[PDB]
Amino acid sequence: GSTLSLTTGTDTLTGTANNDTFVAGEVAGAATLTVGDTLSGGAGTDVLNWVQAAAVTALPTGVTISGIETMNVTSGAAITLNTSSGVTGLTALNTNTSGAAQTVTAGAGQNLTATTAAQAANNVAVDGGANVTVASTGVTSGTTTVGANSAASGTVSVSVANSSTTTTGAIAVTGGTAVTVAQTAGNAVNTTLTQADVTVTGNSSTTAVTVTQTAAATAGATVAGRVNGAVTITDSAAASATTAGKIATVTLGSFGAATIDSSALTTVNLSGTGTSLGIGRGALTATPTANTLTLNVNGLTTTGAITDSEAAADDGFTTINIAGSTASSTIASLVAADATTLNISGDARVTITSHTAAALTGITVTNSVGATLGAELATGLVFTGGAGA
């Protein structure tokens, strides 16, 4: 295609109907996207690169971008833009900060990607879009927050890195077909960073949620210290008496005080270092018929309890299945007051230091390496081992 340059004036630029690219840089440190600029693309390999020392603020008066598929926005300071109008034909919006805030809203049909280096105490906030991606590094105090005002059409994919000892500030997501928030911690060898509190709240499209963190450790001479953030996952229809509920699978990779609340929940995938998981099902008044918790574990270790919060005063899971996989897992306490069957399966040892499951009528290990239960079984309770210790 052909390559077109914006000036500090009013530009009227029209593409070839081909692979053409539009440059909106600076001239004497004066912006080149300016009042009245009108840009026009043609065929579908169209790119606008907007680069400015100055903070992006808004689209300027009389500006119309049209027929351009990818918009790249890079600023020496903050970005604030909304692209649900003025821009038409836009499939992809990418916004880039280094060391300042971001406050972006995309139209549905547009894939947002908000990359931020050295986030520090600055806050990222994004809304709308089709698939959204947040990629934040050098994080510290900064909140990350998605879909607070408008959810994504497609998937959310946050990821956040911190090197600081000062702790990773909130992360909140609302809505999306599937959500992933991936924290890391990269602090120094004799320090403790405590990681970010996460909240995901599904809209009625949210089938899956994933919340990974760096594994906890005790600050040593040559051991980087990490504490884990609370996680709170909530489905739309969590408080409803009648509405279905959509969150089916939840994946965790380390966690502090974790919560799930979904009447559509069947699977939980666990991994790394945990404090507590509390599973509630939606406050549906109807007596539930499918009551099978699948609980796939892999390298999981728990300070405290996996609890079925719903079982106590309401209708919990009757059958729990635990599938240990590729690495040893240890659950300090498993509390499942409505549980009937317990089948431990798979590939690698599952250890349950202490269960509290009074209504259990049978336990059945089918696992290769074996299962160990530290609590003394009920005198009424049948147990069946498989191969393996």
Enumerate the known binding-site residues for Ca(2+).
7, 9, 11, 18, 20, 32, 34, 37, 41-43, 46, 67, 69, 281, 284, 310-311, 314, 338, 386, 388
Q: How many residues does the chain have?
A: 389
First to last CA, the chain: 67
Q: Which residues from 68-87 bind a second copy, rule CB under 8 A?
A: 74-76
Cα angle 301, 351, 326 (rounded to 5 degrees) comes to 70
Instruction: Provide the annotated binding site.
Output: 7, 9, 11, 18, 20, 32, 34, 37, 41-43, 46, 67, 69, 281, 284, 310-311, 314, 338, 386, 388
Number of residues lying near a second copy (CB under 8 A):
32
Residue 380, both tokens: 């009424």
- Residue 190 lies near a second copy (rule: CB under 8 A): no
* CB distance 171 to 179 below 8 Å: no
Cα–Cα nearest to 146, from 122, 117, 123: 123
Kindly tell me which residue out of 49, 82, 191, 319 binds a second copy, with binding defined by CB under 8 A. Answer: 49
Kindly tell me which residue out of 62, 362, 374, 388 binds a second copy, with binding defined by CB under 8 A. Answer: 62
Kindly tell me which residue out of 2, 12, 190, 292 binds a second copy, with binding defined by CB under 8 A. Answer: 12
Residue 260, both tokens: 């799930």
Burial class (CB within 10 angstroms; exposed 0-12, middle 13-18, buried 19+) of 384: exposed
- Residue 283 lies near Ca ion (rule: CB under 5 A): yes
- β-pairing, 192-194 vs 225-227, is parallel
Contact of residue 108 among a second copy, Ca ion, none (CB under 5-8 Å per partner type): none
The residue range among 30-38, 167-175, 249-257, 349-357 that interacts with Ca ion, by the rule CB under 5 A, is 30-38
Q: Which residues from 310-369 bind Ca ion, rule CB under 5 A?
A: 314, 338
Closer residue to a second copy, CB minimum distance, 61 or 379: 61
**Cα distance between residue 16 and residue 59, in whole Å:** 24
**Cα distances (angstroms) measured from residue 285 to each of 1, 222, 311:** 61, 53, 14
Residue-wise over 169-185: b if at least 16 C-beta within 10 A, else e? bebbbbbbbbbbbbbbb
- Residue 384 lies near a second copy (rule: CB under 8 A): no
In sequence order, the 6+-apart residues with CB closer than 8 A to the CB of 63 are: 33, 34, 35, 36, 37, 38, 86
**Cα distance between residue 350 and residue 329, in whole Å:** 5
Kindly tell me which residue out of 16, 98, 159, 207 binds a second copy, with binding defined by CB under 8 A. Answer: 98
Kindly tell me which residue out of 8, 190, 218, 384 binds a second copy, with binding defined by CB under 8 A. Answer: 8
Residue 79, both tokens: 């970005």
Contact of residue 53 among a second copy, Ca ion, none (CB under 5-8 Å per partner type): a second copy
Which residues sit at the interface with a second copy, rule CB under 8 A?
3, 5, 8-10, 12, 21, 23-30, 32, 34-38, 49, 51-53, 61-62, 74-76, 96, 98
Which residues sit at the interface with Ca ion, rule CB under 5 A?
6, 11, 15-18, 20, 32, 34, 37, 41-44, 46, 67, 280, 283, 314, 338
